Design a protein around this ligand. Structure first.
Ligand SMILES: *[C@@H]1O[C@H](CO)[C@@H](O[C@@H]2O[C@H](CO)[C@@H](O[C@@H]3O[C@H](CO[C@H]4O[C@H](CO[C@H]5O[C@H](CO)[C@@H](O)[C@H](O)[C@@H]5O)[C@@H](O)[C@H](O[C@H]5O[C@H](CO)[C@@H](O)[C@H](O)[C@@H]5O)[C@@H]4O)[C@@H](O)[C@H](O[C@H]4O[C@H](CO)[C@@H](O)[C@H](O[C@H]5O[C@H](CO)[C@@H](O)[C@H](O)[C@@H]5O)[C@@H]4O)[C@@H]3O)[C@H](O)[C@H]2NC(C)=O)[C@H](O)[C@H]1NC(C)=O
Ligand SMILES: *[C@@H]1O[C@H](CO)[C@@H](O[C@@H]2O[C@H](CO)[C@@H](O)[C@H](O)[C@H]2NC(C)=O)[C@H](O)[C@H]1NC(C)=O
Ligand SMILES: *[C@@H]1O[C@H](CO)[C@@H](O)[C@H](O)[C@H]1NC(C)=O
Ligand SMILES: *[C@@H]1O[C@H](CO)[C@@H](O)[C@H](O)[C@H]1NC(C)=O
Ligand SMILES: *[C@@H]1O[C@H](CO)[C@@H](O)[C@H](O)[C@H]1NC(C)=O
Lengths: 609, 210, 212
């Protein structure tokens, strides 16, 4: 069905009467299911509300207030789920539909509203309203809310059409036999759990039904009390993961369904992203990025900071600005990619009268630590003298040099007090030349093989007038013994280009915690990967043979099939929509509980229950 | 170079009074002197030409006299509209030159300022700077003292003030003082106070917020 | 009726030139000289020069080497140009005509041209509310350059109790000005108050509602 969000403006007016109307129409035209709230306010006399005929569900609340329109044709609204209230505990609230002009809302023909899952109903000050007072809300509303109800009726603007003789107890929503109240709760047999399509015992609805039914199956409900999966009404969308007794791990349920409103879809509707818990949402959170898996778009929490690209210096907000300076630096917060160039000039640190920009507090440069990519060039003419390396760009992975300074340099580092370039993440310089001049204390630039970094031919390096390669060697400012001959960005073992031995995270080390360290590790392609926490460390032998709890030599706590687990599976969903319960034996091996062990079993059989 | 020296710098008089402006030339120049009125934000307006000749369109209450070195502009019964700068100009020696002007102030009874303090707007605080404003409205005479106090600590060097011209209707002044602090500094203290000293106040008046 | 109307810049960069056009009406340029005289706060009025009826010019001694005055009788225009400007050429510039032929009693003046000499950049103001707790309220017009800023209240409908203060120069090199108005405290709930700020040099127009 066709869905729409609805609104939550409560009694707020949006512009003039016409503008407000236009936005209401724009919102609900062709809507069948309102996932949020249906709010109808300030609709003046003679305005056409006929599109409302399409609505059949309001997941949230229905508020009908301050209207002058004579008729509000919510003829096909079957249910208001009341997942949200308006004031107090009202799911439906129809208030003050009149004006100075003594003309108000006359007809509210909700002849199909048979169910209000949650909440009460409020009716106040509707001098023109007709017929609704006949309605037996006991059939509509859940007994739990009958107490919080607020129904006040008083006709004083006009005479009302009478109900059809065919209506039960003379209860109707308006004129005609079609507007008679259909009763599906109060008239049911005592045997009936909920709704019914007649007084007889045969004519009885499946418990999962709301409003009514055509037959006695869970597929014949008019509306589903909880969820609708294709044609059947279910308690909850079939879970995406199920416990597979064969593999002992959680597998993707082939019959898996996402939740969308009160529906169970096999694939989210267009422009909807699946969350980390199976629900369909218009857009991913702050801590997450969007991706595509098996054709269905999904939200995945961002590994580091979420990719945020911003304009470079001279572009966007920074247009006509000469450098990263005290004013603009604020805008670089959380930036991961810089679309264009970065200029860091002396004018930043001196402050600039002409542009009325104050001196930059060097600490602010930490804002740039999130930058991993610069499409244009990186130009550094000034740096805090007490900082020995270019720390702010320590996470900078790539400079593309799509645009270059003087159409020539993609990396320019000139006359700074720095001792090392500390560009530990710089893995690639796609285009442009690299010039390093005038840094009296700069010591490692040379050791680097810049041809590795370069992506194009013609790129040259110009490293001149820095600290003496001889004086560098002489004062021990050289590459760490853990570095590969490929050079380094500074003295630290993390500044190496590549390791002589192995690496743990970003750091080069001489050995992995293969046999002795506390977080035991294995080696893969010269990388130290920690062992699964459930693997028990092995004295004088390797602890694990790979990533995962199956590649363990020995388990630390319990074993489920081939896996090592901190605890046995308990209360996890499985096929046949049954809960899975296991117990641990003397050898700490997990085994299924007796099917009768509803809350679990400490041991085998009925005994351990 | 021939100097024209005007006195007083400020001439304070009461309405209806006879008022005279003095303009003295370093050299004798006969009657080659002209007088101008300049109201605030206006162009100079020629009042008198050649020491004593009336100018068409100029109120009769304006007249001039003098010959030699000492010249005088007189308003025989001063009116509120006469508040202005008044300048002399010499006509006699190349290049023509102007005096530094006399500003006319009108006396009235002492009037105490009505004082208001305004905290920085939340909007401004977003920019990282807080301007706090103290207003002294409709007082007389112009001499007034604004002192800013922060948690009983008196501020210096971090305030600016300005004063309106004399009002055309009631002859009072108003003064605006702005204390400007960084947001962090703003948030570091508690008591923000403006203390006013003026002839019309029996004791200094302090307005404040936290 | 004799009138002189000036046109010309506001901000001139140092060492660059300043040009003002004085368009006259109500007389003939072939019959009268047009003088240019300026006014600096700390210089009072200073005569700069004159282009006479016959097309000849005279320039005051300090400006003889950097001043140019030309004219077009047919177009009733006088062109003032001054070269090599410095900070202490900041002033209001007037053209003027005398009452009688050949003389120096300036009976007629242009409306003046405010010339700022500064190498800085133009910046539009930010505007913040000053709200009440008879009550006073206002607008803070902060950090703009150069002068002037014009302010009205409720589009000019409220000119009673309004005081717009002289701008002050902030060390940032930017001006700041406040404008306030006093009204009965009983009006704070019922009447809406909007300050209209216009900074013409930057084409910045702002309307700000001020309320508790
Ligand atoms: C530090 O970091 C900060 C933050 O990143 C940087 O801040 C930025 O600085 C920029 C550069 O200073 C600045 O942009 C300048 O804006 C000023 C003023 O702009 C406003 O006024 C102009 C002029 O209006 C009048 O003139 C034009 C034509 O002359 C008429 O059309 C108009 O009707 C007026 O009569 C407006 O045009 C302008 O509007 C524009 O911007 C707004 C939004 O801001 C838009 O809505 C609008 O549609 C327009 O796009 C503003 O209202 C400008 O003066 C300046 O422009 C200069 O650039 C041209 C070409 O590049 C240049 O030739 C001119 O230079 C003249 O002036 C020089 C001195 O300034 C002088 O030396 C020359 O001889 C020459 O005469 C021209 O002035 C800039 O565009 C940014 O707005 C500002 N950003 C922020 C957020 O504050 C800062 O620069 C950094 N500094 C350092 C050192 O690192
Ligand atoms: C420029 O860098 C040099 C070295 O990186 C700094 O000089 C050293 O400062 C440390 C303390 O921070 C001392 O222990 C060393 O002995 C110094 N080395 C010398 C003097 O050769 C120098 O301070 C930096 N300059 C500035 C302005 O910070
Ligand atoms: C940066 O990201 C953090 C994430 O926790 C967020 O709290 C902060 O508001 C963000 N700031 C900006 C300017 O994006
Ligand atoms: C560098 O200098 C600043 C300012 O003098 C100082 O605050 C800071 O502690 C110094 N050391 C650093 C940033 O490691
Ligand atoms: C104005 O400044 C210039 C220097 O740029 C100087 O020649 C001139 O005498 C100054 N005039 C003053 C200070 O009145």
């Amino acid at each position: 069905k066709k869905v729409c969000q609805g609104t939550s403006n409560k009694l707020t007016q949006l512009g003039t009467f016409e503008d407000h109307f236009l936005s209401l129409q724009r919102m609900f035209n062709n809507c069948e299911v309102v996932l949020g709230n249906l709010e109808i306010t300030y609709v003046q006399r003679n305005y056409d509300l006929s599109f409302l005929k399409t609505i059949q569900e309001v997941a949230g609340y229905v508020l009908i207030a301050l209207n002058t329109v004579e008729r509000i044709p919510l003829e096909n609204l079957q249910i208001i789920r009341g997942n949200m209230y308006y004031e107090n505990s009202y799911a439906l609230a129809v208030l003050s539909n009149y004006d100075a002009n003594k003309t108000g809302l006359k007809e509210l023909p909700m002849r199909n509203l048979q169910e209000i899952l949650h909440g009460a109903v409020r009716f106040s000050n509707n001098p023109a309203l007709c017929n609704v007072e006949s309605i037996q809300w006991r059939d509509i509303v859940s007994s739990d809310f009958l107490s919080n109800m607020s129904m006040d009726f008083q006709n004083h603007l006009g005479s009302c059409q009478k109900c059809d003789p065919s209506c039960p107890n003379g209860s109707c929503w308006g004129a005609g036999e079609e507007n008679c109240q259909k009763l599906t709760k109060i008239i049911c047999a005592q045997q009936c759990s909920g709704r019914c399509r007649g007084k007889s015992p045969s004519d009885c609805c499946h418990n999962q039904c709301a409003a009514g039914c055509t037959g006695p199956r869970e597929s014949d409900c008019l509306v589903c009390r909880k969820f609708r999966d294709e044609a059947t009404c279910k308690d909850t969308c079939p879970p995406l993961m199920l416990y597979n007794p064969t593999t002992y791990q959680m597998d993707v349920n082939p019959e898996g369904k996402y939740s969308f409103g009160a529906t169970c879809v096999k694939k989210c509707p267009r422009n909807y992203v699946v969350t980390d818990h199976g629900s369909c949402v218009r857009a991913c959170g702050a801590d997450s990025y969007e991706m595509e898996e098996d054709g269905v778009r999904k939200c995945k929490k961002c590994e580091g900071p979420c990719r945020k690209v911003c304009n470079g210096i001279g572009i966007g907000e920074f247009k006509d600005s000469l450098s990263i300076n005290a004013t603009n630096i604020k805008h670089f917060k959380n930036c991961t990619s810089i679309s264009g160039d970065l200029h860091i000039l002396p004018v930043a640190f001196r402050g600039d009268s002409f542009t009325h920009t104050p001196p930059l507090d060097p600490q602010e440069l930490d804002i740039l630590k999130t930058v991993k990519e610069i499409t244009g060039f990186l130009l550094i003419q000034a740096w805090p003298e007490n900082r020995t390396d270019l720390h702010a760009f320590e996470n900078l992975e790539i400079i593309r040099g799509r645009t270059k300074q003087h159409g020539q340099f993609s990396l320019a580092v000139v006359s700074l007090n720095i001792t090392s370039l500390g560009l530990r993440s710089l893995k690639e310089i796609s285009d442009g030349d690299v010039i390093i001049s005038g840094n009296k204390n700069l010591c490692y630039a040379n050791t680097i093989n810049w041809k590795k970094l370069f992506g194009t031919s013609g790129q040259k390096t110009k490293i001149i007038s820095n600290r003496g390669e001889n004086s560098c060697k002489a004062t021990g400012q050289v590459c760490h013994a853990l570095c590969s001959p490929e050079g380094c960005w500074g003295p630290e073992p993390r500044d190496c280009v590549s390791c002589r031995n192995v690496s743990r995270g970003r750091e080069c080390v001489d050995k992995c915690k293969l046999l002795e360290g506390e977080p035991r590790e294995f080696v893969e392609n010269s990388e130290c990967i920690q062992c699964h926490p459930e693997c028990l460390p092995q004295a004088m032998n390797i602890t694990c043979t790979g990533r995962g709890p199956d590649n363990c030599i020995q388990c630390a706590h319990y074993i489920d099939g081939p896996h090592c687990v901190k605890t046995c599976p308990a209360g996890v969903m499985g096929e046949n929509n049954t809960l899975v319960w296991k117990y641990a034996d003397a050898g700490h091996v997990c085994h299924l509980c007796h099917p009768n062990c509803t809350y679990g079993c400490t041991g085998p059989g009925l005994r351990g229950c | 170079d021939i100097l024209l020296t005007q006195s007083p710098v400020i001439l304070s008089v009461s309405p209806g009074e006879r008022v005279s402006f003095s303009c003295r030339a370093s050299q004798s120049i006969g009657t080659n002197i002209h007088w101008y009125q300049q109201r605030t934000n206006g162009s100079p307006r020629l009042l008198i030409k050649y020491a004593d000749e009336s100018i068409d369109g100029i109120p009769s209450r304006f007249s001039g006299s003098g010959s030699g070195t000492d010249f005088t502009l007189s308003i025989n019964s001063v009116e509120s509209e006469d508040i202005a700068d008044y300048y002399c100009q010499q006509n006699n020696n190349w290049p023509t030159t102007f005096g530094a002007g006399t500003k006319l102030e009108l006396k009235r009874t002492v009037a105490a300022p009505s004082v208001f303090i305004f905290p920085p707007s939340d909007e401004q605080l977003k920019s990282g700077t807080a301007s706090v404003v103290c207003l002294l409205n409709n007082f007389y005479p112009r001499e007034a003292k604004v002192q800013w106090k922060v948690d009983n600590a008196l501020q210096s060097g971090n305030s600016q003030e300005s004063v309106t011209e004399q009002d055309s209707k009631d002859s009072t002044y108003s003064l605006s003082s702005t204390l400007t602090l960084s947001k962090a500094d703003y948030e570091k203290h508690k008591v923000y106070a403006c203390e006013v000293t003026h002839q019309g106040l029996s004791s200094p008046v302090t307005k404040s917020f936290n | 009726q004799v009138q002189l109307k000036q046109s010309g810049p506001g901000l001139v960069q140092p060492s660059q030139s300043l040009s003002i056009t004085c368009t006259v009406s109500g007389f003939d340029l072939t019959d009268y000289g047009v003088h240019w005289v300026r006014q600096s706060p700390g210089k009072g009025l200073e005569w700069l020069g004159v282009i006479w009826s016959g097309g000849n010019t005279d320039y005051n001694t300090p400006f003889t080497s950097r001043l140019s005055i030309n004219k077009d009788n047919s177009k009733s225009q006088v062109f003032f140009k001054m070269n090599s400007l410095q900070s202490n050429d900041t002033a209001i510039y007037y053209c003027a005509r005398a009452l009688t032929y050949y003389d120096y009693e300036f009976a007629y003046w242009g409306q003046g041209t405010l010339v700022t000499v500064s190498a800085a950049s133009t910046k539009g103001p930010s505007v913040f509310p000053l709200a009440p707790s008879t009550a006073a309220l206002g607008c803070l017009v902060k950090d703009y350059f150069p002068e002037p800023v014009t302010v009205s209240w409720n589009s000019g409908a409220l000119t009673s109790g309004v005081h717009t203060f002289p701008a002050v120069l902030q060390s940032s090199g930017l001006y700041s000005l406040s404008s306030v108005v006093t009204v009965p405290s009983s009006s704070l709930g019922t009447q809406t108050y909007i300050c209209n700020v216009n900074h013409k040099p930057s084409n910045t127009k702002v309307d700000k509602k001020v309320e508790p």
